[PDB]
Design a protein around this ligand. Structure first.
Ligand SMILES: Nc1ncnc2c1ncn2[C@@H]1O[C@H](COP(=O)(O)OP(=O)(O)O)[C@@H](O)[C@H]1O
Lengths: 244, 53, 53, 49, 245, 440, 97
């Protein structure tokens, strides 16, 4: 029920469960966006919804995909305060690592350390969980296309493809159908443009909702560079699908 | 029964939202009783008022 | 609000649920005035200033 | 023995539906899947493993 | 409610949120109309500062404060709390100027402010802020307006509004996009700010107001922040007076 | 859509190229791809409402070739690919497909063309769920009519029954009910009588008790007899035909009721006792529409009443009469329902013989059922087990004692009642002597 | 099991299930004929049949305030926006199976 428990993160229940942590898996659907990250054979694509619900905002600034470092992108689902705050740690650990060890920080090592740091925030009771799912994408300098999703508890596992947000279940199902049916673990194109197009299609299928360039934002990690596509760059892609 | 000459809302201050909401709730369905019956929708059977005494 | 019986919490027995708050700052000053018009008033009184108190 | 009781109840319910008068091995497999529960402890949980 | 959740500000409810931060916002509701009007060659700030009694001195108290010499800020909600966030902004701004020998970018300021607010939700020996802060200026990449919620959320804004009468204020801003699709010049967006605040004073009607307007504009203030005063301000007053009646 | 911009824009384009229609057909004969490419561009634009008009032009072009199998194959590939894109809603692409099927059904150019078309159409509409499904049953059943002729009548029926045992909401009440009746007929042709019992019970009995579904009601109970009769259930058939007998259509017209009644007599008699027999056959007896035929009255009454009679006398009476009536005794398999008729009259004799005769010689009994002793004794036994009689048969041909044996108590009980009831009769008599003399 | 034969999970009313609830409710009222439910149901996401019920009653209160006895498309649109607001204001958007 509740008797102390949920008011703290150093209080376990009869079950050994730490309740407050579970509330952040409910706190990351609070932006209402949904993400899709997919793998090809020379890229990883990560796509999130772009909500500009009042025209009193500038549709440009809106995004939750942040460039963390040259080779690392990241999508944030869940709150704007915790988005920036997690980006600060990520930006900083990525820079420090670069200079400590002299060499770039892999998708996995950035994913690993962010989780540990979060774990220590659950161990102590002057901190709290940052209630965001962070999905890091990079094309590795040694393991090629990669996706690591970091959950608010601080679990991390890799993926072929992944979805996040409230409407995750439908996207899970689509993506299962896709790789099962191919019997290979990746999208087969060697043109990164059609993989972005393909990612788009899946996303429309899974959600049931057709999109516009005001309702997408797209990040693309390729080997040795990262770029976020602008609105007119997305737009080009949509008119390839609609009439192939 | 215990009906009085109207108190008036000039001798009641504040609570502007309630006075509006109360007029919409009671008085307008009473004038407009034909219309509610004719459409065949309910008007609010009761309204509940709530908060401190 | 949590002593309301489940009989009336079913649609078509209440339809309007109308909240009365505790009189806000702007509302206190008006209530005070009418009370004050039963007894003598003076220029000394400023209700806005009593309402802050 | 209660899950088993339901298995046979559900199989010959599908027979009333198909408007038959026999229960077949298909009906058992449909039953075999279901009134078993679980399959919801993987939904967001994996940080207790 | 109770059981944490509203008693501590790092403790989360089953709703995945914190109800004290909603309460931080409620104090903003109680605070007074402030707008920022983004423009294509500047930025304009206006504020309603209410007059409690007429013993007060005219044009001598504000909520407009400057950081550097090109970033204007105005806050609504709790007044002394709102002062201290801008003050904390200055100390941050100063550090940027020391290390990088350059004024702060407005998106750089927006990131640093949002870290300060977000920190006051990580500890429980701290209180959150209970203020929004419209801010922005002109830099390299032009004019930018941002607005910060006590939530620690921000986004770019073609119009920002806060305080009690903001319902009227947001609608008038959206009309301003439609009537002029460049958002109008900064000179006339001052006048446009005066007409807004007067309508916003129909929500605050019980007392009197003082209109303080400031600007920072690419060539109409020559890239610097100054107070809008004198014949410029007198104009705004007159346009606004004309247009309510 | 909900918004106003696609509603106007696409309708506008559509109207401009629907005056270009005579140019489009002139173009199509020159080069099929060129004319098609105009309407391909046009139906890949948003808004369902204009596309409707725009797919008639595609339809028109297939009719002009009349029809080219190659085109048909091409048209159905294209529809399936277009739905994936979005189909301008996957709730509307199905109206477009719906037209392809309409044309096929109402226009048959060749035998060979119509055969080849069904394969393509059925394969598209698997993933569609609307009126396409209704139309689906007819495009398959056209191919059932082709494949009645081929050796594949069994296989063809099997596919269609699998479809139609899944109810559909796109199907109206009258259509569903009429379509299922067809599927039963096909299971008989298959040779599988189990499949036919299932389809029968899929549709309900209380749906045919409406007057609008009376056309259908007569077809259903006539079918249903055929299935039963083969399975040699004689009780169910007589009860089925009686339903028809009650039908207004059959009764009103003074010649429609005639063979329906004749048929009910033959199966009521063929049924092998049971108390269902007694109530049913007593209803036909009270009717005076059994006094409108002179053949039928004699047969039912001869089986009902307690009479001692022999096989050839009865056999002789009914040998030329019922053999020119098929679906009764006339057929080749119903030579084993004339063969049944022998058992039936001797099954009734045993009921007769047991009540009236307590003890009778086995020898005399043999000539009465007109069989050997061996045959008789078996047939006595069948009805001692099914409880119809109690008998004891001696192999030595001493006796057959037709009885249920009393016990010491039953005799004592029966002798109390005789003496009790006697006393009552004596006392009332004296009452009536006094009355009679006094009035006299 | 064996208390029991089917566990029926009934979610929030379907994307085209709400459309059927609008059909039942919009039948009751006197109207000019309305064909704007397409947009309405989209506005009415996450709603329960209780809130759709309210939307008909509200849509008809506006007709009676404007002095017409007919539900027009203008007023249906108002009902669904205003209910959506006041639903999440006094709600917490409760999470249950
Ligand atoms: N808005 C008001 N203006 C002036 N006096 C008020 C006001 N509301 C209440 N009071 C005073 O308090 C008294 C009792 O409140 P009452 O109407 O009985 O409350 P409730 O029914 O909410 O418990 C009134 O008779 C009046 O004297």
């Amino acid at each position: 029920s509740a008797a102390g428990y949920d008011r703290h993160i150093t209080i376990f229940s009869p079950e050994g469960r730490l309740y407050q942590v579970e509330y952040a898996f409910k706190a990351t659907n609070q932006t209402n966006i949904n993400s899709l990250a997919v793998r090809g054979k020379d890229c990883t694509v990560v796509i999130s919804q772009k909500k500009v619900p009042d025209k009193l905002l500038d549709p440009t600034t809106v995004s939750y995909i942040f460039c963390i470092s040259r080779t690392i992108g990241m999508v944030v689902n869940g709150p704007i305060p915790d988005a920036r705050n997690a980006a600060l740690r990520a930006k900083a650990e990525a820079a420090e690592f670069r200079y400590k060890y002299g060499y770039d920080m892999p998708c996995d090592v950035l994913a690993k350390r962010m989780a540990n740091l979060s774990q220590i925030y659950t161990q102590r009771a002057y901190m709290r969980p940052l209630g965001v799912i962070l999905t890091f994408v990079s094309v590795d300098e040694e393991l090629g296309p990669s996706i690591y999703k970091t959950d608010p508890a601080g679990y991390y596992v890799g993926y072929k493809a992944t979805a996040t947000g409230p409407k995750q279940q439908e996207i899970t199902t689509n993506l299962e159908n896709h790789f099962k049916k191919s019997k290979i673990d990746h999208i087969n194109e060697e043109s990164w443009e059609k993989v972005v197009e393909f990612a788009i299609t899946h996303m429309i299928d899974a959600l049931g909702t057709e999109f516009s360039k005001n309702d997408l934002e797209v990040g693309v990690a390729t080997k040795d560079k990262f770029f976020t596509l602008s609105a007119e760059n997305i737009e080009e892609r949509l008119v390839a699908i609609a009439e192939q | 029964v215990d009906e009085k000459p109207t108190e008036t809302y000039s001798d009641v201050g504040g609570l502007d939202k309630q006075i509006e909401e109360l007029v919409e709730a009671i008085v307008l369905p009473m004038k407009r009783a034909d219309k509610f019956k004719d459409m065949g929708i309910r008007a609010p059977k009761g309204a509940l008022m709530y908060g401190p005494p | 609000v949590d002593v309301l019986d489940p009989a009336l919490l079913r649609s078509g027995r209440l339809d309007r649920k109308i909240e009365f708050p505790l009189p806000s700052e702007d509302s206190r000053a008006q209530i005070l005035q009418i009370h004050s018009r039963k007894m003598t008033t003076d220029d000394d009184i400023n209700w806005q200033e009593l309402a802050r108190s | 023995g209660a899950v088993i009781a339901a298995i046979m109840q559900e199989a010959g319910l599908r027979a009333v539906r198909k408007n038959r008068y026999v229960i077949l091995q298909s009906d058992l497999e449909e039953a075999y899947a279901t009134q078993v529960k679980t399959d919801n402890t993987v939904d967001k949980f994996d940080f207790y493993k | 409610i109770g059981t944490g959740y509203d008693l501590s500000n790092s403790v989360f409810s089953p709703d995945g949120r914190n109800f004290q931060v909603e309460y931080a916002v409620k104090a903003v509701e109680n605070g007074t109309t402030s707008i920022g009007i983004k423009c294509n060659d500047g930025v304009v700030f206006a504020v309603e500062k209410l007059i409690t009694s007429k013993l007060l001195v005219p044009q001598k108290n504000v909520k407009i404060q400057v950081v550097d010499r090109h970033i204007g800020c105005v806050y609504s909600g709790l007044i002394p709390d709102g002062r201290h966030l801008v003050n904390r902004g200055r100390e941050e701004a100063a550090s940027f100027k020391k290390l990088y020998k350059t004024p702060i970018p407005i998106p750089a300021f927006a990131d640093r402010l949002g870290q300060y607010v977000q920190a006051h939700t990580l500890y429980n020996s701290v209180r959150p802020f209970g203020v929004s802060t419209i801010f922005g200026g002109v830099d390299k990449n032009g004019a930018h307006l941002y607005m910060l919620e006590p939530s620690g959320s921000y986004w770019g804004y073609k119009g920002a509004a806060t305080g009690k009468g903001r319902q009227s204020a947001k609608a008038e801003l959206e009309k301003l996009v439609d009537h002029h699709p460049e958002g109008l010049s900064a000179r006339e967006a001052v006048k446009q700010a005066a007409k807004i605040i007067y309508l916003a004073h129909e929500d605050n009607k019980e007392k009197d107001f003082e209109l303080e307007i400031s600007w920072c504009s690419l060539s109409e203030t020559n890239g610097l922040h100054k107070f809008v005063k004198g014949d410029l301000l007198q104009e705004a007053i007159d346009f606004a007076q004309k247009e309510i009646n | 859509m909900s918004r106003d911009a696609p509603i106007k824009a696409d309708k506008d384009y559509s109207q401009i190229l629907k005056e270009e229609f005579p140019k489009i057909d002139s173009l199509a004969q020159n080069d099929c791809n060129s004319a098609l490419d105009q309407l391909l561009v046009l139906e890949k634009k948003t808004r369902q409402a204009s596309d409707l008009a725009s797919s008639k032009e595609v339809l028109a072009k297939i009719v002009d070739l009349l029809a080219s199998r190659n085109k048909w194959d091409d048209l159905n590939e294209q529809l399936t690919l277009l739905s994936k894109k979005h189909g301008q809603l996957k709730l509307s692409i199905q109206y477009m497909i719906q037209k392809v099927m309409e044309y096929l059904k109402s226009s048959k150019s060749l035998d060979l063309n119509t055969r080849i078309s069904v394969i393509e159409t059925i394969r598209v509409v698997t993933e569609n769920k609307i009126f396409v499904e209704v139309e689906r049953a007819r495009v398959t059943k056209d191919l059932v009519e082709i494949k009645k002729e081929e050796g594949k009548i069994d296989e063809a029926a099997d596919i269609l029954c699998e479809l139609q045992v899944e109810t559909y909401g796109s199907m109206e009440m009258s259509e569903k009910i009429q379509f299922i009746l067809e599927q039963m007929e096909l299971s008989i042709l298959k040779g599988d009588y189990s499949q036919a019992t299932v389809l029968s019970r899929k549709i309900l009995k209380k749906t045919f008790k409406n007057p609008k579904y009376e056309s259908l009601k007569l077809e259903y109970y006539n079918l249903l007899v055929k299935i039963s009769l083969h399975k040699r259930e004689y009780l169910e058939v007589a009860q089925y035909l009686q339903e028809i007998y009650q039908t207004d259509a059959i009764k009103s017209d003074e010649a429609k009721w005639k063979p329906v009644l004749s048929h009910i007599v033959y199966f009521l008699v063929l049924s092998p006792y049971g108390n269902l027999q007694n109530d049913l056959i007593h209803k036909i007896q009270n009717d005076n529409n059994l006094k409108k035929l002179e053949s039928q009255e004699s047969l039912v009454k001869l089986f009902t009443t307690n009479e001692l009679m022999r096989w050839p006398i009865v056999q002789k009476t009914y040998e030329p009469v019922l053999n020119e009536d098929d679906l009764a005794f006339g057929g080749e398999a119903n030579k084993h329902h004339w063969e049944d008729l022998q058992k039936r009259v001797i099954e009734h004799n045993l009921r007769v013989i047991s009540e009236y005769y307590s003890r009778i010689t086995l020898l005399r009994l043999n000539e009465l059922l007109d069989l050997t002793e061996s045959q008789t004794e078996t047939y006595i036994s069948d009805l001692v087990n099914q409880g119809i009689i109690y008998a004891k048969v001696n192999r030595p041909a001493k006796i057959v004692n037709f009885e249920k044996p009393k016990n010491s108590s039953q005799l004592l009980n029966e002798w109390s009642h005789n003496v009790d009831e006697l006393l009552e009769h004596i006392e009332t008599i004296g009452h009536l002597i006094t009355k009679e003399e006094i009035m006299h | 099991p064996g208390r029991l034969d089917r566990k029926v999970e009934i979610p929030l009313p379907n994307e085209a299930g709400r459309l059927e609830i609008f059909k039942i409710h919009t039948a009751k009222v006197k109207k000019t004929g309305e064909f704007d439910f397409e947009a309405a149901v989209k506005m009415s996401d996450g709603f329960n049949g209780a809130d759709i019920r309210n939307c008909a009653t509200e849509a008809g209160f506006f007709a009676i305030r404007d002095d017409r006895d007919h539900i027009n498309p203008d007023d249906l649109m108002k009902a669904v926006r205003k209910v959506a607001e006041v639903k999440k204001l006094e709600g917490t958007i409760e999470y249950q199976k």
